[PDB]
Copies of this chain bind each other. A is one copy, B any other.
């Protein structure tokens, strides 16, 4: 089960609803016996920009700096910037990771985007040989608790912004699941700036109620990596048998693997698929 939790918050104001939601999760989990650690990016004045400075020492090839290779090497040899390592330790010690943030330009705040870029270093957070379900964080679970200015209807299939499931895909599949994370249902609190005070109090309590049993939840469905030929040769394309079999399925496997057919309803919002 789950015993330790990491709450990554990306909001500058201690007076925001996001901070309240972070406080609610901390209280709720602790009161349930969990150990809670925080990564309040702004309060920590976190540096989100990847650079050659992330490697405390000489680079393998300063004449042509390539961050991927250099950062992985620094990782292996233990030359990663201290601030990066400290976060990597929080990740390794955590069973549950909660990402609390306000949706910004249909994605995560830049400070958090940068946190992934500098913290999710190769070898540590992933390998091309163990992508997705086989990733390093397979024993861990992640959840996005998001707040927005736009109303839920704006994000429905007929809303002007379009399906929220598409917006979540690059984050939940491309970032979290790629590293092995079992991704749980996102906590979506729409139009928080247009919500009555009593309703907000209920949102907080609802979030705490869910956290009581968060670890017994069934995670989102992503196509298993066993359906693909995971080698540079086949170009990591679906196995031909799976393709043929899939040809007789009404729905695609997920948002990203829609295969040109109907995307399973709320594939990135609701579990059981």
Which residues of A are at the interface with B, using a C-beta cutoff of 8 A? 12-13, 15, 42, 48-52, 63-68, 104-111, 113-114, 116-117, 120, 131-132, 149, 151-154, 156-163, 166-167, 169-171, 173-175, 193, 225, 228, 230, 232, 235-238, 243, 254-263, 265
* B261 and A262 within 8 A (CB): yes
Of the listed residues A13, A113, A175, the one surrounded by the most CB atoms of chain B closer than 10 A to its CB is A113
Q: Are A68 and B114 in contact (CB under 8 A)?
A: no
Nearest chain B residue, comparing its CB with the CB of A111 = B49
- Jot down 24 A-B pairs with beta carbons below 8 A, ordered by A: A12-B50, A12-B67, A13-B66, A15-B64, A68-B193, A105-B120, A105-B174, A106-B170, A107-B107, A107-B113, A107-B174, A151-B232, A151-B236, A153-B237, A157-B257, A157-B259, A158-B228, A159-B228, A161-B174, A161-B236, A162-B173, A170-B170, A260-B262, A260-B265
Q: Is the CB of B113 within 8 A of A105?
A: yes
Copies of this protein in the assembly total 2
Most chain-B CB neighbours within 10 Å: which of A52, A109, A156, A162? A162
Q: Is the interface of A mostly helix, strand, loop or mixed?
A: loop
Q: Cα distance A155–B149 when bound, in Å?
A: 31
